[PDB]
Amino acid sequence: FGQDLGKKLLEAAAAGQDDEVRILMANGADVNATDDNGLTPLHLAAANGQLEIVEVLLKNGADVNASDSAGITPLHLAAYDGHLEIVEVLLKHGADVNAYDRAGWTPLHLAALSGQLEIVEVLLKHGADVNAQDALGLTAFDISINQGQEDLAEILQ
Amino acid sequence: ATRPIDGLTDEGIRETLTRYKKIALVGASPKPERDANIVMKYLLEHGYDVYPVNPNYEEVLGRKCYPSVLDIPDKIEVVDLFVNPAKAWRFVAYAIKKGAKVVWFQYNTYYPLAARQAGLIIVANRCMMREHKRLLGE
Numbered sequence: 175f176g177q178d179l180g181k182k183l184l185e186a187a188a189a190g191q192d193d194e195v196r197i198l199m200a201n202g203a204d205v206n207a208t209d210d211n212g213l214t215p216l217h218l219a220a221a222n223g224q225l226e227i228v229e230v231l232l233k234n235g236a237d238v239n240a241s242d243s244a245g246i247t248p249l250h251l252a253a254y255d256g257h258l259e260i261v262e263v264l265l266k267h268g269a270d271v272n273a274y275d276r277a278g279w280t281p282l283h284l285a286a287l288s289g290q291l292e293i294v295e296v297l298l299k300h301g302a303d304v305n306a307q308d309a310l311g312l313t314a315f316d317i318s319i320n321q322g323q324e325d326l327a328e329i330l331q
Numbered sequence: 332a333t334r335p336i337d338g339l340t341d342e343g344i345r346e347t348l349t350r351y352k353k354i355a356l357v358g359a360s361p362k363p364e365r366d367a368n369i370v371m372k373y374l375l376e377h378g379y380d381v382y383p384v385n386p387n388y389e390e391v392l393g394r395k396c397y398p399s400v401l402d403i404p405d406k407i408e409v410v411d412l413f414v415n416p417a418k419a420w421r422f423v424a425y426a427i428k429k430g431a432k433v434v435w436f437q438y439n440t441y442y443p444l445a446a447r448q449a450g451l452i453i454v455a456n457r458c459m460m461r462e463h464k465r466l467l468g469e
């Protein structure tokens with residue numbers, strides 16, 4: 175029963191159980207399973223900062239650019255929650271550095287929103303659109319300025 | 332890292348803690364490893380009416396546990412969230428249908444699609460237990 179196995183894979187990934195992810199994978203569960211809202215094991219592993227599990231999902235062919243019904247991707251989640259190593263890797267495996275979610279946010283908007291310096295650096299390195307605009311016509315520049323961190327706005331010009 | 336993502340003051344925090352007793356707790360569970368467990372214990376122990384929400388359980392800490400928020404018979408005032416950031420923001424919408432006054436994001440649960448959706452009053456990156464201890468605790 176793949177459903178049960180998929181739900182088991184999702185939780186183990188989110189929970190950072192290296193060993194367990196190995197048992198489900200070597201035992202048939204789909205690395206590309208989804209929940210009711212289109213979340214995949216990679217989304218959850220990138221959200222929670224589980225690096226080694228991110229590596230093993232990609233090696234076995236998990237889609238690096240999977241999106242939920244709100245248009246969220248693993249790169250969105252890793253950048254809002256401050257997981258740099260995971261950002262580094264995602265991009266190495268081809269993550270779309272300029273994907274937009276439902277609110278019209280990119281991973282640049284998102285790193286600005288919770289104020290990650292080192293993650294803003296890597297994104298501009300990999301071609302992030304410093305003039306991308308969200309549903310409300312705002313940039314990652316406008317944002318950090320609203321929030322009062324001039325230095326970031328300085329680097330995000 | 333425990334820095335408030337909301338901009339309320341603690342007069343604002345004392346208020347919600349103080350006027351609201353009806354609490355939906357999302358992501359509730361029997362596991363001790365889950366922070367939701369201890370916090371529910373602590374709320375129940377300090378006069379709150381707490382209804383656990385988790386479709387993977389019929390029951391939690393000796394309380395009927397519900398599949399969804401929509402599922403709760405009586406009124407709820409505050410929705411207390413213990414789920415993944417890829418997930419929590421979806422409860423803003425349900426709270427609004429329920430007629431709740433507050434949505435509370437515990438640590439590592441917030442994602443900004445939640446502002447775009449929001450009553451209501453949002454609390455983000457704080458613990459209901461710790462704020463209580465600090466503001467009202469003996």
Ligand SMILES: CC(C)(COP(=O)(O)OP(=O)(O)OC[C@H]1O[C@@H](n2cnc3c(N)ncnc32)[C@H](O)[C@@H]1OP(=O)(O)O)[C@@H](O)C(=O)NCCC(=O)NCCS
Nearest residue numbers: 188189358360366384385387413414415437438439458461
């Ligand atoms: C959010 C957190 C639990 C991590 O979550 P996770 O590992 O990704 O697991 P999930 O987000 O998928 O879900 C957690 C749980 O709620 C459940 N759940 C999942 N989806 C759910 C849904 N749609 N509705 C209700 N509950 C759900 C689970 O099944 C579960 O508990 P279980 O292990 O007993 O089954 C964790 O970061 C945390 O506890 N944050 C808050 C900590 C904090 O505030 N501590 C304060 C101390 S004072």
